[PDB]
């Protein structure tokens, strides 16, 4: 939302 | 013969039924009968069309990969070469890694390109610069080995020459550039469409003096575009925009633009949703958002982002992947596309980094290899950017309208409903929305009717769909209640003139101005 680019995307609903 | 069996089937039926099974299944079926074993181990087509889906060449099963690739399989050759070069999957000692790995990878890359049919050459992107600063990286080894093979190949060497020339093109050296140009000349000598077009592009920048050379260039462009190229078609669609200097009639230019504007069909659809366990398009939105952010970081053009999204969609439609691998898919696709078209690429060590080290070097290597092998080598496809460029190089419009047209062209990436329309219709509708937003008196001109080959009534639905799916409805959020705004943040730059923060009209206003009702 949001955090910076480096991330582990949250796909889970 | 009341109940016919697979035993007595002819050669054609057996050939077709055995060509659509994986390697494990084809090995298992080989245990049923002796005639099946004779058919499989006698006729090379069944091996030639066999998958190697989700396998990777390990020391246990190197012989299987070699046997299948050597007799007509392209996926096996690609995977074998990539494993040999990237040194993942094969237990090669560091002392003897370089030479043996380079020769094996080069031979398998050459075989992979040779077995490719009906696609532009692509194997040059796995060995493109930048290379190792110290020592000798295996990329250079396979480069020189491929050069020697081309010097010694006879069957089909034009693709190898084109790939070689594309390799040194991205080298910042005048000598390197002359060796590259020297390369597509030798590739064009034997016959290659892309090499010839690149040669022509290297000549347009050099000599623009008299209309005679312009007519020569137009003749060559017509020759290239008539055969079926893509970059040639797009380039020819603007040399007709140079209508005043170029000897020709208005009707001919209008016909050329109409031909290139009525030769596109909608491709993507809800296929991806029904081909996996589930995506719900929210995961795709997240992934494309993240890719847009990463492209914003490293100064990546619109074309490369569009190509990455299209490659992701193609692979997702072809070979299924689990949910926890989507980000790996996106990073591999960005690496592959940036290596293909751009100049500054997303290096592998950097590529894994943005994922917070969730995945590893080997996993990214495997994903890249399988992505390239699953696309058959076709990377460049029709995209909205090309038609937006061809439409905005025809009609002279103000700069703010150009920026708005670009902004609505780029907003089609996140949403998948806009795939129901061809790129031509969507680019035309984007230009129409850009013009109507600024409130110009005449949105659609007679010039536009003669050129795009479509009328207003052919474009009302597309404008409505584009505007709705871009601005209307709501942003997908579940817990943070915060809209994903990488595209908007990408277009707040001063290089785009702070375009994204300017206001736009609503759907009701657009329908009123376009003469479209609602219910």
């Amino acid at each position: 939302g949001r955090p910076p680019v480096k991330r582990r995307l949250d796909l889970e609903t | 013969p009341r109940n016919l069996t697979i035993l007595s089937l002819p050669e054609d039926v057996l050939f077709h039924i055995l060509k659509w099974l994986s390697v494990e299944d084809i090995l298992a079926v080989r245990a049923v009968h002796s005639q099946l074993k004779d058919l499989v181990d006698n006729h090379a087509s069944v091996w030639a069309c066999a998958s190697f889906q989700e396998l990777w060449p390990s020391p246990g099963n190197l012989k299987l990969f070699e046997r299948a690739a050597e007799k007509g399989n392209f996926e096996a050759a690609v995977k074998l070469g990539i494993a040999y070069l990237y040194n993942e999957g094969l237990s090669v000692s560091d002392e003897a890694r370089a030479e043996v790995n380079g020769l094996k990878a080069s031979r398998f890359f050459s075989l992979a390109e040779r077995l490719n049919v009906g696609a532009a050459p692509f194997i040059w992107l796995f060995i493109r610069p930048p290379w190792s600063v110290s020592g000798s990286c295996c990329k250079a080894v396979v480069h020189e080995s491929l050069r020697a093979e081309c010097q010694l190949q006879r069957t089909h060497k034009a693709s190898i020459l084109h790939c070689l020339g594309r390799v040194l093109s991205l080298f910042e050296d005048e000598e390197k550039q002359q060796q590259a140009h020297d390369l597509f000349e030798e590739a064009a000598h034997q016959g290659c469409l892309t090499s010839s077009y690149l040669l022509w592009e290297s000549d347009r920048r050099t000599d623009v003096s008299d209309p005679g050379r312009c007519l020569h260039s137009f003749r060559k462009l017509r020759d290239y575009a008539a055969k079926g190229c893509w970059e040639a078609q797009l380039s020819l669609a603007k040399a007709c925009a140079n209508a005043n200097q170029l000897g020709l009639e208005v009707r001919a230019s209008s016909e050329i633009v109409c031909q290139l504007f009525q030769a596109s069909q909608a491709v993507s659809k809800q296929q991806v949703f029904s081909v996996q366990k589930g995506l719900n398009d929210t995961m795709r939105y997240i992934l494309i958002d993240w890719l847009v952010e990463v492209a914003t970081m490293k100064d990546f053009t619109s074309l490369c982002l569009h190509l990455t999204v299209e490659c992701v969609d193609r692979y997702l439609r072809r070979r299924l992947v689990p949910r926890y691998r989507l980000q790996l898919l996106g990073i591999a696709c960005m690496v592959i596309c940036t290596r293909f078209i751009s100049k500054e690429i997303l290096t592998i060590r950097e590529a894994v980094w943005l994922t917070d080290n969730t995945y590893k070097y080997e996993d990214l290597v495997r994903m890249m290899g399988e992505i390239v092998s699953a696309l058959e080598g076709k990377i460049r496809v029709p995209t909205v950017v090309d038609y937006k460029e061809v439409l905005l190089t025809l009609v002279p419009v103000e700069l703010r309208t150009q920026h708005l047209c670009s902004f609505l062209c780029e907003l089609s990436l996140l949403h998948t409903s806009l795939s129901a329309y061809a790129p031509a219709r969507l680019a035309a509708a984007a230009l129409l929305l850009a013009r109507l937003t600024h409130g110009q008196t005449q949105p659609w001109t007679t010039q536009l009717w003669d050129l795009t080959g479509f009328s207003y009534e052919d474009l009302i639905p597309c404008v409505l769909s584009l505007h709705k799916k871009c601005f209307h409805d709501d942003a997908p959020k579940d817990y943070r209640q915060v809209s994903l705004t990488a595209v908007k943040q990408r277009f707040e730059d001063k290089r785009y003139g702070e375009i994204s923060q300017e206001e736009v009209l609503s759907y009701s206003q657009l329908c009123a101005a376009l003469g479209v009702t609602q219910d």
Binding site: - | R2, N3, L4, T5, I6, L7, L9, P10, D12, V13, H16, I17, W20, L21, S22, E24, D25, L27, A28, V29, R30, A31, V32, H33, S34, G60, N61, K63, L64, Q271, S274, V275
Partner: protein, 140 residues
Amino acid sequence: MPSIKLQSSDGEIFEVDVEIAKQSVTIKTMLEDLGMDDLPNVNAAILKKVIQWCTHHKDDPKRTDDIPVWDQEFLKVDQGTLFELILAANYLDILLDVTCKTVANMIKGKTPEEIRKTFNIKNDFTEEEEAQVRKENQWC
């Protein structure tokens, strides 16, 4: 105006339209060779299902989702009927890929003995062949 006569192996005659009959390429090439441009295993039922299949698919311009309800509800009648269908199109140049996918699914996710059981194949390898298969399957 045009009228293409058709007869079956049992002598039954059925009327079909032209555009659907244009799907088959064997009739087209035979007509072009004979200048009239412009089956040992077939009974009335087979024609009837082929007419239904062709009629239900007219707007068509892969994966195992393109199979419709009619095919998956009619291709489970008999295996030998399915074999007669594949060589059939093999012969009429038309559904070929649909049938190939349908049969291949029954083969992929099963064990060889399951294939022997379903295909009514008693046995063809004697005692001194199972060890050779096992050793030739130890490659993976």
